[PDB]
From a paper:
To better understand the details of the interaction between MANF and BiP, we co-crystallized BiP’s NBD in complex with the isolated SAP domain or with MANF. MANFE153 hydrogen bonds with BiPN200 and BiPT203, and MANFK138 bonds with BiPN239, contacts observed in both the NBD–SAP and the NBD–MANF structures. MANFR133 undergoes different interactions in the two structures, forming interchain bonds with BiPE217 and BiPD238 in the NBD–SAP crystal, and intrachain bonds with MANFD119 and MANFE136 in the BiP–MANF complex. Charge complementarity between surface residues appears to play an important role in stabilizing the NBD–MANF complex. By contrast, superposition of a structure of the related bacterial DnaK in the ADP-bound state, in which the NBD and SBD are undocked, suggests that the SAP domain could engage the NBD of a client-bound Hsp70. A binding signal was registered on MANF and SAP probes when BiP was in an ADP-containing solution, but not by ATP-bound BiP. Nucleotide release from Hsp70 chaperones can be measured by following the quenching of fluorescence, as bound MABA-ADP is released into the aqueous environment in the presence of excess non-fluorescent nucleotide (to prevent re-binding). Both the presence of MANF or the isolated SAP domain inhibited ADP release.
The ER-localized Hsp70 chaperone BiP plays an important role in protein-folding homeostasis. Like Hsp70s in other compartments, BiP does so by the reversible binding and release of unfolded client proteins, a tightly regulated process that depends on the concentration of active BiP and on the nucleotide bound to it. MANF’s SAP domain engages BiP in the ADP-bound state and disfavors nucleotide exchange, thus acting as an NEI to modulate BiP’s activity. Our studies suggest that MANF contributes to protein-folding homeostasis in the ER by antagonizing nucleotide exchange on BiP, thus stabilizing certain BiP–client interactions.
Author numbering:
A (entry chain A): 28 to 406
B (entry chain B): 130 to 169
Amino acid sequence: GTVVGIDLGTTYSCVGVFKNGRVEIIANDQGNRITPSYVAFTPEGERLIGDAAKNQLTSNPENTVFDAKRLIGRTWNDPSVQQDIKFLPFKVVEKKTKPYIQVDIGGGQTKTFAPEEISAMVLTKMKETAEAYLGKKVTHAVVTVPAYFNDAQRQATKDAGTIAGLNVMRIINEPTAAAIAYGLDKREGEKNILVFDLGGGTFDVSLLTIDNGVFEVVATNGDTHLGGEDFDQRVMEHFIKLYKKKTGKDVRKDNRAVQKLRREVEKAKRALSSQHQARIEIESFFEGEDFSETLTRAKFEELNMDLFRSTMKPVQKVLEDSDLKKSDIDEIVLVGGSTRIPKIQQLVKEFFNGKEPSRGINPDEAVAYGAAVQAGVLS
Amino acid sequence: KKLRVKELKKILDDWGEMCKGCAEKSDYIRKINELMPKYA
Ligand code: NA
């Protein structure tokens, strides 16, 4: 007997299997326990879902679909949608007051999708990731959504699951799933929980209460355009400038080199959470010299400090809107790989007067872990 | 809404119903509204 929990993230998704009374987070074809929520299409109309799509973004900048979760379940003239379409490089068009994503696949072929249909493809990839590992079909799922999602967005997410061939047993809230993964459902009494979720592209803060082991979302805030990718892009810019100074060449003219640089920067960011120095290489088709420079933790911190500091403002705001002081917070839950960054851990701890965040689960996997726990309960 | 969670669990337990995978207070309240008579 096997059921699944899926974190369907804005930038990254994750699948856990509940089997024999425990959760196993599953690695994809590339050995990665998170999969980008990215979709592209081959000229023959085949679906490229996850790493393959993300990894060709710079060469296919207008026909690589990502961030569909920003649009899912929303109306066209929603001010959120109208702001987000300014930043999305692929075509988003209106049909009957709803947003649709349009891509050119080649040879006079255009495909048009509701956000639900794109998210269904991402869910299918996660389903198939679990199935490839286990060597059997998986069907019954819990899928998570942001705590602020309304009934239409919850329905849209369920519909994406249904399209993907899943039996969506329940849609549950991301911060609640994370709280469950970290074991907060065992807490007794009345406690206040701050969930600090810094994803690849978004930042969500949720204030949850627990009362006799049962959660309630009291308030939510955040910054919809602050994420781990912003830290990567500032470092990429730093290295693009350094490359220009060393070689005289604009590395942006080499699209694959920029993509390779993004990987090196992501790897360096991960390394700098445990080490104090990391090497970043730039390989290019148009330059003989393989560029190679070190990035220190201190420089990584300097490049991003204002963004790191900006994460505290939504935390202040959620406390105000829940009539709570920082001293009323009993538990702190960190979600997202970016929360491994020591300076972020430092700032959160200092904000809460030295209070320790919960430990025990990879913060990129906590939401899928909790979803899988709940899938276990519900089956 | 104003009732504590132990009280909501008690209501369901008094009606001989369990809240399977009810992670949130609203899950308890949803199931109670499905069992409770309102039109006496
Ligand atoms: Na994400």
